[PDB]
Scaffold this active site. Sequence first.
Site, mmCIF file in Angstrom:
data_model
loop_
_atom_site.group_PDB
_atom_site.id
_atom_site.type_symbol
_atom_site.label_atom_id
_atom_site.label_comp_id
_atom_site.label_asym_id
_atom_site.label_seq_id
_atom_site.Cartn_x
_atom_site.Cartn_y
_atom_site.Cartn_z
ATOM 1 N N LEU A 1 1.177 -1.162 0.103
ATOM 2 C CA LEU A 1 0.216 0.044 -0.342
ATOM 3 C C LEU A 1 0.940 1.144 -0.035
ATOM 4 C CD1 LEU A 1 -3.166 -0.026 -0.025
ATOM 5 C CD2 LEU A 1 -3.140 0.634 2.154
ATOM 6 N N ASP A 2 0.970 2.497 -1.045
ATOM 7 C CA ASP A 2 1.473 3.579 -0.602
ATOM 8 C C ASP A 2 1.047 4.172 0.024
ATOM 9 O OD1 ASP A 2 1.680 2.271 -3.767
ATOM 10 O OD2 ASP A 2 0.244 3.809 -4.366
ATOM 11 N N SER A 3 2.004 5.390 0.809
ATOM 12 C CA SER A 3 1.798 5.869 1.709
ATOM 13 C C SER A 3 0.717 6.916 1.760
ATOM 14 C CB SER A 3 3.166 7.116 1.428
ATOM 15 O OG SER A 3 2.815 7.896 0.490
ATOM 16 N N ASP B 1 -2.054 5.525 0.684
ATOM 17 C CA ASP B 1 -2.753 4.307 0.295
ATOM 18 C C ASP B 1 -3.099 4.240 2.458
ATOM 19 O OD1 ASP B 1 -3.014 5.247 -1.663
ATOM 20 O OD2 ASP B 1 -2.142 2.978 -2.429
#
Lengths: 178, 385, 339, 75, 198, 92, 95, 157, 114
Positions: D35-37, D39
Amino acid sequence: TYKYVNKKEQESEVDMKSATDNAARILMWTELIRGLGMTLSYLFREPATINYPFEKGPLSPRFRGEHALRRYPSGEERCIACKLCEAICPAQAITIEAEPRADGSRRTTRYDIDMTKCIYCGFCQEACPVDAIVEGPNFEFSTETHEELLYNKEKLLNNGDKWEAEIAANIQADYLYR
Amino acid sequence: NMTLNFGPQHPAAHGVLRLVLELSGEMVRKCDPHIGLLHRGTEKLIEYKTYLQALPYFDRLDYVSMMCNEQAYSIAVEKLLNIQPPPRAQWIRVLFGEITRILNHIMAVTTHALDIGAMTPFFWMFEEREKMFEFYERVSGARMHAAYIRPGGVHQDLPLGLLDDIYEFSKNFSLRIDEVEEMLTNNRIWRNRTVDIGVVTAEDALNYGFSGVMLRGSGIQWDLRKTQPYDVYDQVEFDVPIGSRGDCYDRYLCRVEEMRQSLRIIEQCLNKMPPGEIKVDDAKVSPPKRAEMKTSMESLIHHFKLYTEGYQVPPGATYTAIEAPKGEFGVYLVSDGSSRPYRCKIKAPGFAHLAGLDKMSKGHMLADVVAIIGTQDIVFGEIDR
Amino acid sequence: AVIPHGKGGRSSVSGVVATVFGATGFLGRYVVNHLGRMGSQVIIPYRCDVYDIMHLRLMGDLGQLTFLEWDARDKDSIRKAVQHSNVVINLIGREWETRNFDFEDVFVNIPRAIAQASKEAGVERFIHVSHLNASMKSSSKSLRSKAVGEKEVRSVFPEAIIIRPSDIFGREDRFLNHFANYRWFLAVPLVSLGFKTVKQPVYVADVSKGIVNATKDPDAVGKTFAFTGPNRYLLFHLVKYIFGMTHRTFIPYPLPLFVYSWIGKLFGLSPFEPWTTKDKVERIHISDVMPTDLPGLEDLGVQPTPLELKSIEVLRRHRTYRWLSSEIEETKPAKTVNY
Amino acid sequence: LDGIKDRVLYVLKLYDKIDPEKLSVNSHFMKDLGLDSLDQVEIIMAMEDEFGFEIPDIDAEKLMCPQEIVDYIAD
Amino acid sequence: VRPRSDVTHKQLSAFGEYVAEILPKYVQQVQVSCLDELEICIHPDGVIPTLTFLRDHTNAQFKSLADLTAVDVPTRQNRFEIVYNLLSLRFNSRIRVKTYADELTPIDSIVSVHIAANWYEREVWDMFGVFFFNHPDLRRILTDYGFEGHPFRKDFPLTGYVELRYDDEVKRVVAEPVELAQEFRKFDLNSPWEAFPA
Amino acid sequence: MNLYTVIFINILLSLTLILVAFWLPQRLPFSMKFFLVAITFLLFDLEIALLLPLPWAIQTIKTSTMMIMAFILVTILSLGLAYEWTQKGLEW
Amino acid sequence: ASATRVIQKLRNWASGQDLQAKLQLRYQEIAKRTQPPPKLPVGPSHKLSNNYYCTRDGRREVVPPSIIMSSQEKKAVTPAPPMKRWELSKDQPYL
Amino acid sequence: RSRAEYVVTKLDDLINWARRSSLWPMTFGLACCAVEMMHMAAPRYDMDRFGVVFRASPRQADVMIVAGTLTNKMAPALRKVYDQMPEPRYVVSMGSCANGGGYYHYSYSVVRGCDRIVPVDIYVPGCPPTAEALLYGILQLQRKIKREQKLKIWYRR
Amino acid sequence: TSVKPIFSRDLNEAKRRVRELYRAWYREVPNTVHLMQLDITVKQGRDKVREMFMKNAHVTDPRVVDLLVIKGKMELQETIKVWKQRTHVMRFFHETETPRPKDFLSKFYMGHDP
Ligand SMILES: NC(=O)C1=CN([C@@H]2O[C@H](COP(=O)(O)OP(=O)(O)OC[C@H]3O[C@@H](n4cnc5c(N)ncnc54)[C@H](OP(=O)(O)O)[C@@H]3O)[C@@H](O)[C@H]2O)C=CC1
Ligand SMILES: COC1=C(OC)C(=O)C(CC=C(C)C)=C(C)C1=O
Ligand code: SF4
Ligand code: SF4
C-alpha cells in the site's frame, strides 16, 4: 484653500419659534413637498429626446465611426501598402500583405480590418501618409453575423466609395487642425 | 450565516461584483468581495504595446473618467522623457480634466441614487452628460474613449467653436446641480439612507490607503491638485471641499461641491487659455504635422519612425499620481530604453476603497452595503485592470 | 480536399465539408458539436426559423458553420446544399406522421432524393441513419418504412454507409425522458408489465462520435454499423430505474397492448406533436434485436458509455427539490439481461 | 477487542487495493502488502469512520500494520 | 525640456541619507532619480522594519501605501522586485522602498504596517507568485478561480494556455488549450542604433 | 348570492389568465425581530378587534363608561408599546 | 422654451428657480457648425536658425539616477519642509 | 382574405408585433459599453419610447445586451443568466470587446467574443458603440423579430 | 545550496503537510460532488485527487513542496468555501477535450510538430 461641507459653525440654541419651524418640518413633511415641486416643474419642461430614425444626434467632422479606404479622384486606390497603419494599430486589427501590381505599382493584395478587434482609436486615420484609411462618419453598421463584421479590402473600398463625398467634406473641414 | 453572493447581473453590483455576504439575519456580519470578473490583462498587454498604442488602454481602466486617466499616463511618459507639454495643451488638459470630474461625479451621485431608489436625478444629469461628451466628440471624435490627451501634449487643437459651447454649458450647469441639490440632499429619506452610514475615521482612512473623496470626507485635507500641482493646477484657484464627519452624506456633499468647484476651474480655463501649439515641438516625441510630413523629408522620417517604432523613452521608472475624480490615480511605469514599456502598475483609486468595504460596512444591513459601494465611486475597470 | 492543419481544437481545420440536413435534431445537435469541435466545415440545411437554430451557432467556429434555407418537397434546395459538400449525413426522421409528411417521406422518400443529389454533386461519402431492428416487415410502419429506405438509397448512392442506431439515451432524448415523464400519469402502463422487450440504450454522444468517426475513416463503406450500447435491460428495470433516479413512485401496471395502441392513437390525434404514437408504442415494446452485425461503437472507435453513468444528468430535471442533491451512488442500478 | 480487530480487518477487507489473502493482523501494507503512503492515510481515514475516532497524523504514520491499528484503536 | 528644481533633489537626497543612517541594517542602496524621486532599496528582511520606521517616525511620517508592485526581471537571480510607494501627507513627499524576492523565497507581509497592502499583496501573489508570510488571507484576487500559472510573469504567454467556450454536448462552459485565429503579430521594434551614453 | 356571483367571476377571470399564461406559450433565515413583530402585530390586531365595535358602542346610552373603557384600552396597549420601545424590541 | 407663459410661471415656481433663464435644451445659442477655417499657430523650434536639436532635446540628456548610500551633531532631516496648513476659503468658508 | 395560410400569417404578425414593441432588455453591465447605453436609457435617446425597459431581471428580460469584455471569470455566469432567461429571448452583443475580443483579444483572461459563450443575434460595433448605434442595433433586432414566422413554419410542418 | 526554509525545514516535515491536505481533499470530494451536483463518482473524484497529489510526486526540494500545499490548500478553500462552481471543478476532469495519442506513429499521422 479648503471648504467645510456639513460643518455646523455653531450651536444655535433652540428658540420656540425655531423649534416650531423644525417640528413643522418633521410633522408636515415640508421639505418632502419641496422635492415634489421640482419634479412637477420639469413635467412642464420640453422633453430633450430625439425621434431616433427621423432625427439624429449631432456628430461633428472628427467622429471616427466606421473604417473606409479612399481612392484618388482618378480612381487609383490611395493605399500604397506602407503598412504602418498595421504597425500603429493598438489592437492588431489591420492585416496587410502586398505585392507589386502588374502595373508595377505598390498595392495591397489583402487589407483586412477586423472591426470586432478594432477599438476605433483613430490612429490609423492619423498614421497613413496618403491618408488612404479614414475614420468614416457612419456608426450604424450593426450586423447579424460575426463574419460580416470582419472587413476585407473590397468591403472597405466599397465603404469608401459610398461615403467618399462626406468623408471628403469631413477631411476638408478638419485638415487645417491636423 | 446564510452566505449570499451579490451576483454580477444585479444592477447594484456595477455589472461585475460577487460580494460573498454572510447575513447574520438581515444584518450582514462579513463581506468578501470577489473582484476579478473584469480583469482584462491590461498591464500585461501594455508591455507588448508601444507607448502611444498603450494610451488607449488608459481610457478604459476607469471608464467614467477617461481623460483624467490619460493625463496620468501622459504626465508619466512625459516625465520619463524630460519633455513638458506646450502651455495651451496644459490648460486644455485642465479644461478636459474638470469636465471629466463633473462627468464622473454626475455618474457617481446619480447612479448612487439609482441604487438607493431615486430615479429622476439620473435622467436630468445624464442629458447634461451627453451635452459634455459632445465636447469630447467635437475635440477628439469619440464620445468617450477619446485618446485626445497624448503622452506629449494633446493630439489636435480645439475646434474653433468649443470654448463658446463649454461656456454655455458651464453657464447653465450649476442650476442643474442645484436642482438635484433640492431633490436629494435634504430629503429625510436620503439623509436617513446616507447619514451616519460607513463612517471611516481619519487615521483608518490613511492606513487603508483610501486617498480620495473618502480621504477628504473624514476631514483629512489632501488634494493632489493643490498639494502636488500637476499640469497647470498652480495657476487655477479652487477650494477643496473637505467634509467634516465621514458619513456617506458628507462624502456626497463633497462630491456635489467638487462639481461646483470644477465649474470655477473650468471658468478660469476658458477665461485664460493661451494662444500657442497643442503638442511639444520635438518631432522625436510628438508626431510631425500633416502638412510637414508631406513636404519635408525630416518630418516623413520622424512620422514613419514614431508611428511604426516609437518614442524610445530613456531607461528609468516613475510613479506619477494625479487627482482622478475617484481619487489618486497613479502609473508606476518602469522603462527600459525600448519604445515599449516594461511594467505599468496602474494604481487604481478603488482597489484600496473596495478593500475598505468590509471595515466600513460594519454592523450594517443588506441595504447599507448598496450605499457603501455607491459612496466609494468604484468602477471595476480600475480595480480589475 | 483540405489538408488537416492545426492542433485539434476549434479554430483548426480537419477538411470535412459536410451537409447535415436534419441537424436541429437531438442526435443532430450532437453531430454538429463534434464536427464543429474537430474543425470540420459544416453546412446545416434548416427549415425552422433562425431562432431555433441559434443553439448551433456557438458550436463550430466563424465561417465554419453555414446555414441553408431548404424545403424537402423542393428538390432544388437539396441540390444547392450539397453543391460544395464532400460528406452528406442524413438524420431526417420523426415519430409522428405529420399532416404534410408521411413516414415514407421522412424516412424513405426524402432521404432518397437527398443522397440522389449528393451523388450528382460527387460527394465522397453519404451516411444514412435508420432505426435499429428495422425489418421491411416490422410492425411499426416507421421501422418498416425506414427499412424500405436503407434499400433504396443504396441504389441512388452505392457504398453509402448506413449506421442503424438503437433508441438513443441522452439528455433531451425520448427513450429516457418519456418514461420519466410518465409521472404526470398516476399509473405508468407497461405492456406485459414491462417484460419481454429487453432494450439496449446507447448514449447520444457515443452515437455522434461514432457517426463523426465514420466521416473520417476509409474502413466504412457500404457498412451497416449498429451502435447499440454497453448493457441490455428488460424494460422493467429501465422504467423503475428511471423513476428511481427521478425519485418518483413506480407503479408498474400491465396494459393490454391492443388497448394501448389505442391510447397512442389518442395522443397521436394531438395537433401539437403527439406525445405518444401508435407507431411509438409498438416500437417501445418492440424487443431490441441481438448483436450480431457490423459492430458500431468500439468498432468505429468509441467505447460505449453505460446508462447509469450519465443517467443522473438526463433525469435530474424531473426530480423535486427534495431529491435534487441526491446522487447516483445513493440510488441503485438496474439489471441487464443477456437474453 | 477481537471484535474491534474484526472491525479493523473489516475495513481493510473493504479497501480495494488491500488483498484479502495477504491481509493478516501482522501484515504491514506500507512495507508488505504494498500500500502506498497515501493509501495508508486513506485507510486510517476509513478507520476513523468505522471507529468514529480521529487519529493525528503523528500517530497515524506510526500505524502501518493492522494490529498496530488495533492497538491504537484500543487506547 | 521639463523644469527641474534641485531643491527637491537635495531635500530628498538628504532624507535618503537620514533613512539609511537610521536603518543601516537593511538599506543597501538609496538613490534619487533625475525625476526627484527617492528609492531606498532594502534587504528583503528589512520589509517590516523599514516600513514601520517610515510609518511611525516624527521626522518621516509616511502614512499611506500608494502601491505595492513587483517588476519581474527574469535575468535577475531574485526575479521579482517588490516596490512599495509611500506617501507622506505631512511632508508632502513620496518615497519608494523596493526589495528583491525570488519565486520560492517569500517576503514578509506588511498588512500589519499598512492594511492597504492586504489586497495588493494578494494581487502580487496572483500575478507574480511571490508569497507573503503572515498574511491574513492570501488567495487569488484577479485571476479566475481555477487559473493555473501566475500571469504577469514575463515567462507567461500573453494569450495564455486556456480559453473558454460553451459546449452543448456537456451543456457547460469548458476550457480547451488556446487556439487563436490570428496569432499576436510580434512586431520587432527595437532599432539597431542607440540614442545616448546612458 | 349576488356576492357569490361576483366573486366566482373574479376567480374565473384570474384562473383564465393563469391557464392561458401556461397554455398560450405553446434555509435558515431567522431573526427574532421578525417573529417578535408578528407577535406584536396580533397583540395589536386583537386590540383592533376590541376597538372595532366602538362605532356601535358610541350610541350606547352610558357614554361615560364607553369612553372610560375605550381610553383605558388604548392607553394600556400604548404602554405595552412603550415598554416595547424601552426594551430592545422595536429596535430591530 | 416655446412654453405658454403660465406653464413657465408654474415651472419657475414649482422648481423655485428661473429655469427659463438657463434652459437645458439648446436653441440657436450653440456654436454654429462650419465655424471658419482655422490657421493654427506654429510653435517654437520652427525657426530656421539657432534651432539646433542638441540644444532642445531633454529626452536623453537625462542621466542614470544619482546614487547615495550604495553598499558597493548631524541634525535631523525631513523628507521635505513640513507641509503648510491649508486656509479656509473666503468666498464660501462653510457650505 | 380567406385562407388558413392568411390567418396564420396575420396572427404571427400580431405575435411578432407584441415581442417587437415590448423588448425588456437585461444589461449585465460589463466594462464601459453599459455607460453608452445608460446614455440610451437617458433623455437624449430614450429607449422606453421604443418600448424598452431600463432595468429588467433575468426572468422578465426578452433581450440580453452584453456590454463590455467577457472575462473568463464572468463567462460561466453570463451563460447562467442567459440560460435562466425566459425562452423567447434574444442577445445583442455590444462593443468590440464583446463581439470579438477587441482590445484585450489576446489577453489570457478575456473570452474572444460572447458568441463563444451565448448565441448572439445582433452585433453592435464600436469601442464605446455610440448610443444611437446601440439604438440602431436594438431597432435591427426589431426588424429581425418582425421577419420571424414561427406560426407559418408550424402550419406547413 | 544554502537555501532558506519557507515553512518546512525538510522534506520530512513537509510531507506531513501533504498528508494533511490529502486527507482534506479526500474528505471533501464527496461533499463537492453533492453541493455542486457534479455528475461524477466520489470514487472517481478521489482518484483524481490522487492523480494530482502524485503528478507532483517527483519534487525532492522542501521549499517547492511547501508552496505546493499552500497552493493546494487555496484550491480546496475555493471548493469547500464554494466560490468555484461546477464549470471550474469539472475542468479538472478534462471532460470535453479530445485526448491526444502519444504514440509516435499516431502523432506522425496527425501533427507536423510533435
Ligand atoms: N431515439 C432516437 O432518437 C433514434 C433516432 N434514430 C434516427 O436518427 C435520426 C435523428 O433522430 P432525432 O434527431 O431524434 O430526430 P428529431 O425528431 O430530433 O428530428 C431530426 C431532424 O429531422 C428534421 N426533419 C424531420 N422531418 C422533416 C421534414 N419533413 N422535412 C425536413 N426536415 C425534417 C428535423 O428538423 P425540424 O425540426 O426543423 O423539422 C430535425 O432537425 C432520425 O431520422 C431517426 O430515424 C434512430 C434510432 C433511435
Ligand atoms: C456608475 O457605476 C456603475 C453602475 O451603477 C449605477 C452600474 O450600474 C453599472 C452597470 C449597470 C447596468 C446594468 C447598465 C456600471 C458599469 C457602473 O459603472
Ligand atoms: S497606411 Fe494608409 S497607405 Fe500605408 S497602408 Fe495603411 S492604409 Fe495603405
Ligand atoms: S468595447 Fe471598447 S468600450 Fe466596450 S468595453 Fe471593450 S473597450 Fe470598453
